Amino acid sequence: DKLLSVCMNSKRHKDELYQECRPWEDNACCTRSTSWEAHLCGLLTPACRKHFIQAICFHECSPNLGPWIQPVVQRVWGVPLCQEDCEDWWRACHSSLTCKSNWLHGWCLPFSYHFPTPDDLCEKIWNNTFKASPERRNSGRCLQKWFEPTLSNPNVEVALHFAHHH
């Protein structure tokens, strides 16, 4: 689509957002009901679910997903996530357990078993919707799953970097 920032054309995707999806308020690819609805084996930790919902706000609401868009026959394949992202993800969800490794969401063994390494979690989840990046959060070569809404968005310049250099 137009400019540098483009949203994948689909049903789920095209000032007031709910909880973890707030960081993208200034530019977002997801409508309010998408965030609100995004917040809707065994009891899962508050941190683990926090991380999942964060990932959903990222997939739906982020303008920066352009470069990795691949067609279904839209879909996103292997957006690099920073080491700390998948790390805190896999550690928060470590204690928790899960039944199946498909983990199809929107489309009872421990998590560590299905995903021994954070690479396993971020890669195997959603058929490689994310890539496990060796680059740490601050380098600028990897996308940040979540950021505090007040601060500037680190992922813009990265989406440009991958849109041109890669």
Numbering used by the authors: 21 to 34, 41 to 66, 79 to 111, 118 to 151, 166 to 224
Paper text:
A decade-long search for a protein pair mediating this event in mammals culminated in the identification of the glycosylphosphatidylinositol (GPI)-anchored glycoprotein Juno as the egg plasma membrane receptor of sperm Izumo1 1, 2. Whereas FR homologues are found in all vertebrate classes, Juno appears restricted to mammals. Together with this observation, our studies suggest that the molecular basis of mammalian gamete recognition evolved from an ancestral FR that lost the ability to bind vitamin B9, but gained the ability to recognize Izumo1.
To gain insights into how Juno recognizes Izumo1, we expressed the complete ectodomain of mouse Juno (residues G20–A221) as a soluble protein in glycosylation-impaired mammalian cells (see Supplemental Experimental Procedures). Following enzymatic trimming of N-glycans, affinity-purified Juno behaved as a monomer by size-exclusion chromatography and yielded a ∼10 μm thick crystal that diffracted to 2.7 Å resolution. Although glycosylation at N73 is important for secretion of Juno (lane 1), there is no electron density for the loop carrying the corresponding GlcNAc, suggesting that this conserved carbohydrate affects protein solubility rather than folding. A crystal contact, however, fixes the position of the N-glycan at N185, which is neither conserved nor required for secretion (lane 2). Despite their overall similarity, there are striking local differences between the structure of Juno and that of FRs and RfBP. Whereas in the latter proteins three highly ordered loops generate a deep binding pocket for the respective ligands 4, 5, 6, the corresponding regions of Juno are either largely disordered (loops 1 and 3) or adopt a very different conformation (loop 2).
